[PDB]
Design a protein around this nucleic acid. Structure first.
Ligand code: TTG
Length: 494
DNA sequence: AAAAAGACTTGGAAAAATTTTT
DNA sequence: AAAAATTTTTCCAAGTCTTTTT
């Protein structure tokens, strides 16, 4: 029988668990060497590469078809990192990447892909059965009286970094994660997981103030990557329920907050004027609270608080509309945001004052960062941060649009059209793009449907119109939103 | 403070598995 | 059979906000 964690007494703040036991992470499949017939060339002559160098060479060979393997930054980074993985004998022969011929390696990898879909019933069924025994042995964990699923237990294989957009580190080598890089987290009364034969873990800790099971440091950015519980668990779902509850508490406080920031545009001090114009953008246009990145780590992308002077172009009268602000920046994942939006009279006058005596490279809202904006938002409502406005706007627009687009006389397949049409409006507001059915050509429903929309709004909609939840939510989503699907009436109001 | 770390939050695109069209 | 159009898993990062160092 399935566990209804939502009927339980809410888990206390501070300590995340009392008990934790798991079988550790599943390491990336080992490197299968190149056979004798698959040769590498340098200056037209054959050259057998050492195992370490040959492994790095394969990553490039597999990506050879893409246009990014011809870029300055990619090639510079790849070659620099391939030098480290070479022997002193190889370092003296291989001076540049351009005299290297990977074409034969590339052909073998295409040949293996063509040979992988031609497998028998003893190969196609066997590998899918060894994946199932792996899913049941390492894909589950015990955390406080119950067996819950683990998210991504299979650690990512080594390769070359690409990232999203115009990334400075594209082409850098993602190293193979070893047991000696793993920090295991579990309880003192639990059976500490066994490392692969011949190896030992980096650390075995017992921190109950955190929710992760396994952690390590990746080399590209230096940040800690984690292995946590799947979305269907108590620890993730309760936090997901609390996120929506916070957005619901902002609903009965928004009119009071909107009136306050409208008055703040007139204030004597500029520290308050900028804070209010930035909050106006976050409320109206659902922008992300733009944190400050370190120059040269990730692609140059901004958000609301990190907006520069060059990202906006002021127009008093354009297209027959008053006070137009033309936004043109790259948001998260290098997705372009473009909107010609008519603002209030005081907001336009304020933006003119913020763009004065400044160069294009300078920050628009100086004397303001994400911490100052969130410190103020905490003084208005408890637990309020800038991303709560995005959750609020997305969820309320779905509720509003579902009421507006669903009609009583329509059939079940036609009602699904209306749900997806309401979901479309949420994706346009949140700027969730999908690169090139005529409507949803450039729009992506996935991100909002799972991160942004209180699932109870959908469960309420479904029980009202007689649409079974399986027509809206698939197998995996139904498990993530189980709390909502069980506990929720037709009368749910955000 | 205020930089740096740490711990959460937020798929779409490319491939492979099928299914349908020629 | 053989190819094309769909469906569906496999591949791969980047923000937000909190907590620690410097
Ligand atoms: C595409 C879309 C995005 O980007 C946004 O929007 O933001 C995303 C999402 C949504 O929300 C999600 O969810 N996700 C998850 C994940 C991702 N990415 C990635 C990359 C890489 C890797 O490796 C991974 C895995 N790990 C293990 C965690 C991932 C995941 C995203 C995105």
């Amino acid at each position: 029988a399935a566990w209804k964690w939502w009927e339980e007494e809410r888990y206390p703040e501070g300590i995340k668990w009392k008990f934790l036991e798991h079988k550790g992470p599943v390491f990336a499949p080992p490197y299968e060497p190149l056979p004798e017939n698959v040769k590498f060339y340098y200056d037209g002559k054959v050259m057998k590469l050492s195992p370490k160098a040959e492994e790095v060479a394969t990553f490039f060979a597999k990506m050879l078809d893409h246009e990014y393997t011809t870029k300055e930054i990619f090639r510079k980074n790849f070659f620099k990192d391939w030098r480290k993985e070479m022997t002193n004998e190889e370092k003296n022969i291989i001076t540049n990447l351009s005299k290297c011929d990977f074409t034969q390696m590339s052909q073998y990898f295409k040949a293996q892909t063509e040979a992988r879909k031609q497998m028998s019933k003893e190969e196609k069924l066997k590998i899918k059965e060894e994946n199932e025994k792996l899913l049941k042995e390492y894909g589950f964990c015990i955390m406080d009286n119950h067996k819950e699923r683990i998210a991504n237990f299979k650690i990512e294989p080594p390769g070359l970094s690409r990232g999203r957009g115009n990334h400075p580190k594209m082409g850098m080598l993602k190293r193979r994660i070893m047991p000696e890089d793993i920090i295991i987290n579990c309880s003192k009364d639990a059976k500490v997981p066994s490392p692969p034969p011949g190896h030992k873990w980096k650390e075995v800790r017992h921190d109950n103030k955190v929710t992760w099971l396994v952690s390590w440091t990746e080399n590209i950015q230096g940040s800690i990557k984690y292995i946590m519980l799947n979305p269907s668990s108590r620890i993730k779902g309760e936090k997901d329920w609390q996120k929506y509850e916070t957005a619901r508490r902002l609903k009965k406080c928004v009119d009071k907050i909107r009136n306050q920031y409208r008055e703040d545009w007139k204030s004597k001090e500029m520290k308050v004027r900028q804070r209010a114009v930035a909050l106006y953008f976050i409320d109206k246009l659902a922008l992300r609270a733009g944190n400050e990145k370190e120059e040269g780590e990730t692609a140059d992308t901004v958000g609301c608080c990190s907006l520069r002077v060059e990202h906006i172009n002021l127009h008093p009268e354009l297209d027959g509309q008053e006070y137009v602000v033309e936004f043109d920046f790259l948001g998260k994942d290098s997705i372009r945001y473009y909107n010609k939006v008519p603002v209030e009279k005081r907001v336009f006058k304020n933006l003119q004052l913020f763009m004065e005596n400044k160069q294009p490279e300078d920050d628009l809202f100086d004397r303001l960062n994400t911490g100052i904006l969130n410190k103020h938002l905490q003084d208005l409502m408890e637990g309020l941060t800038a991303k709560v406005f995005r959750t609020y706007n997305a969820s309320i627009t779905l509720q509003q649009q579902l009421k507006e687009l669903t009609a009583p006389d329509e059939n079940i397949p036609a009602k699904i059209l209306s749900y997806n049409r309401a979901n479309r409006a949420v994706a346009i507001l949140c700027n969730h793009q999908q690169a090139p059915r005529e409507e949803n050509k450039q729009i992506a429903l996935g991100t909002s449907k799972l991160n942004y929309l209180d699932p109870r709004i959908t469960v309420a909609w479904c029980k009202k119109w007689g649409v079974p939840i399986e027509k809206i939510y698939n197998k995996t989503q139904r498990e993530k939103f189980a709390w909502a699907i069980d506990m929720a009436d037709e009368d749910y109001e955000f």
